[PDB]
Amino acid sequence: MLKYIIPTIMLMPLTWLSKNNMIWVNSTAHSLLISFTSLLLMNQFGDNSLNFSLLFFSDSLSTPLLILTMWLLPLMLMASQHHLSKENLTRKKLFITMLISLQLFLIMTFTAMELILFYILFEATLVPTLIIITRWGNQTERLNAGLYFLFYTLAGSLPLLVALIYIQNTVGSLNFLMLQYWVQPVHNSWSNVFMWLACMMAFMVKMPLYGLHLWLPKAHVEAPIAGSMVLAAVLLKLGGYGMLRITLILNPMTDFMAYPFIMLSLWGMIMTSSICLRQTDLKSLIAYSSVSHMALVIVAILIQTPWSYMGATALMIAHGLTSSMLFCLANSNYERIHSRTMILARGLQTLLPLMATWWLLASLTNLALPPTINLIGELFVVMSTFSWSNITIILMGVNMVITALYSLYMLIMTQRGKYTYHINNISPSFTRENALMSLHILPLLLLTLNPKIILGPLY
Amino acid sequence: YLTHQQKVLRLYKRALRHLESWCIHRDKYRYFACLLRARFDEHKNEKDMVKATQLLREAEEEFWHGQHPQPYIFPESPGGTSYERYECYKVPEWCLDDWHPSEKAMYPDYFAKREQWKKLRRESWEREVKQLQEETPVGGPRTEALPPARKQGDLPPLWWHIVTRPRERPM
Amino acid sequence: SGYTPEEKLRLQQLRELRRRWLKDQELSPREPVLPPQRVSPVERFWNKFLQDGALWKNVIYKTYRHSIFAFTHVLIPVWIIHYYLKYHVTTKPYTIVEKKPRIFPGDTILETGEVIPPMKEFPDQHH
């Protein structure tokens, strides 16, 4: 992984040593080159994972998450450089540095062989994320959002640290390959119940699990646009990636310990989907949409079937591109009208025709139109959950109806009807904005041609 | 607030329109339109305004009982089949300010004319604001009526968005 | 009821401005001023060819347009599709599966030359 870690680190001197007026050009160009080389991680084998060294490895689960991560950095630089245009040079460079450091921690997080190396980098991502939210967020609420983000994550992750060290003392190793062969079944005792919760709650909070999600509508809404993109696209998926890994050592206890969290997710997805119908803040609506989608990933991971694991991997990738696109679309309106209220600016299809096409495509992927990879992931999860219990099709079916309703409600409210008379500063869409949207949707639809590369290790 | 006379005349127009929806055929409608007018003429002269109010309330109850459940609506009236059909084509004039110079060069005459209108609006604005300040009581305006221009070379205050509004068939 | 003198005067002032505005929406004869226009030599033939009129040379042009369509949108696509099916799809097993042909009594099998026997004698119903 050093062929990706070292180039990522070099983005920092590149940013600091660049000419003042070339910081965005230079960092964007070279971050795209790194993203291009990440395609070499697609050398996956049917039986064995691609094991680089004692520290790092990549299998079909981490590889797509790595490619998404490295793809997101140039998109975030494009999304940020407009609203940071009046920031002074040194603070711009520090903003880019936080983004680079977050990428460094993420790519090492997804390839860490040892769960305690995974833990340190998994917590490490908090620091740059907190700084981005609180320093460069726009509203007073960013300070409160940072505290909710920080202490929800740590309340869960500190018990995880105790559990992981306990496992290493008992097994002798936290190396993930070793745990595949030395894993022992978990006896059903009270002490193992709390080991199970310690190993899972930190990941549940990051998903987020319904009930433990209050940090997300604060953090995702108060962050700057780059903060929201990475928060929704990648950082929510650390929880899914962590759960997909750690459930290996929790069988068979997951059979019954899953029930309370499956109920929270199956009912929670309907609750959060309903909330979207009455949200007044466009960014807040998009944030609650993420909670509903990640409820499917939680359920898929907990029922532990080959189909649910393929579906979960696809959804995580599909949601990452879609939710990031929606935040970027919402941000482009915000940079014009300087409000997040959804009813403020209406009929934007009349004033911004091409941008209204991006809204439509973003909405259709969000409601999982076939054959998008959003639908492929959702379908595979619904199939596996039907086998877990036929009755689940009712909750899955209702959620798909509600999801269509709020996805198109967002489209209709903002893009259709009559334009707001007094809003007269809706200038034409910039080339930058149009390129930013198409760099989300084009890869998303291309993956429909070759879905296997985002179906994970069970494929 | 609607006066009593306004309430009666609104009822008469509503009653006739629903009557027409029932009758359909023109000769049949002419017949019953004249019977309905005769009913209104029967109490045209009713000086007692307490009794004229009672007649009005009963007529409205009779109307609600007799209204057509699916009355005729002019196509472009609210609730009609073409209501708001062309709003998607109505673009505000301020959008022309954002046209690229190569797009403006295709209509040099239109945009030269447009600059004269914008100059006219700029030069009138201070006088329009002043006229409203001086003609408005201290508490503030008590109705939504706007005044005309009192002088020569003055424009009626707050004219721009009325005069320059999109055409009903903009495209 | 009826407009007050103030209301009438304002409506008249607005009516004059509105009609001046609407009159100013008319395009002048030269508008739109289009930029340098490129033409094709293939159009050169047809512009002169059809200004004559007639209904015998308004048919050659129609035949020409339909033939260019048939070639680009039928013949070339079927060539590509036929090449795709003959040399890529049908070279793999069970990609194209035909329902086997119906065989009737008295038929002859082309592959084998076998002759299928006729059905037995019908107990001729009245009709």
């Binding site: 004033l351 | 209509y107 903009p170 | -």
Partner: peptide, 12 residues
């Protein structure tokens, strides 16, 4: 009589 059609900028 040809009239001017007010549209948003299509250039960009």
């Amino acid at each position: 009589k040809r009239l001017f059609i007010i549209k948003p900028s299509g250039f960009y």
